[model samples]
Target: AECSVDIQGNDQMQFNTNAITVDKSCKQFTVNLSHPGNLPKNVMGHNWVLSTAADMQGVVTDGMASGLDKDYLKPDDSRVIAHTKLIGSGEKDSVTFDVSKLKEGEQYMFFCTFPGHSALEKGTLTLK
Candidate 1:
């Protein structure tokens, strides 16, 4: 079967869920990110960025420095497996990446790279 997941971000700095599953049968996986708040991207904006759990801190740190114009993500950052564009209220973005890049026992993480949003808008991506 193919894999697809939906996530919602709000103005309260929270995500609808804190975990996601990626099926092993999928050759590719898709993550759909939606912002349900009324704030602009510069205020309560968000994005979904995939990387190893261990690389989260570093990625988020560097991403913040990259600024909003870059989706708050470093340009050509090798640590990122997949990422969506920065989105604001009533907006949405999606990303599809090769599932082969994931390993069964390895841990993956997904978070919003929009400035301070990472502290609350983060979740785990598990391959099952």
Candidate 2:
């Protein structure tokens, strides 16, 4: 019930890790995304958004038009498994989801949906 992970996004548009594992034992999982930089939110905001590998591009594409107020994501997007609020410079956001939402062997992706950032700020997540 307490399984969680800490991920970071810096002013350099990089993530601390490119891969993550979610232990199957937890009923709920949490993702903590922190932006430990001095950049302003509108300039270099970051968010942790989860979706399938195949859907990542499409989601990012749609999110690009959603704007910062919506955290750069389509409103109530079903393809998004989970996501944190967009933040910047010493700010943080956390998201928790039921483990049942994930399945084995499914290709999952975690990325930043802040406009052009998703292309470089992405990673893989697996259920183990």
Cα lDDT tens digits, model 1, 62-111, are 99888877889999999999999988999999899999999988999999
lDDT values, one for every candidate:
0.90, 0.90
Q: Tens digits of per-residue lDDT for model 2 on 61-116?
A: 88988877887999999999999998889998889999999988999999999878
- Residue 127, model 2, lDDT: 90
Q: Which ten residues in a row have the lowest lDDT in candidate 1?
A: 1-10
Runs off by more than 4 Å, candidate 2:
none
Question: In model 2, what is the error at residue 126, expressed in angstroms?
Answer: 0.4
Checking candidate 2 for backbone clashes, the offending pairs are: none
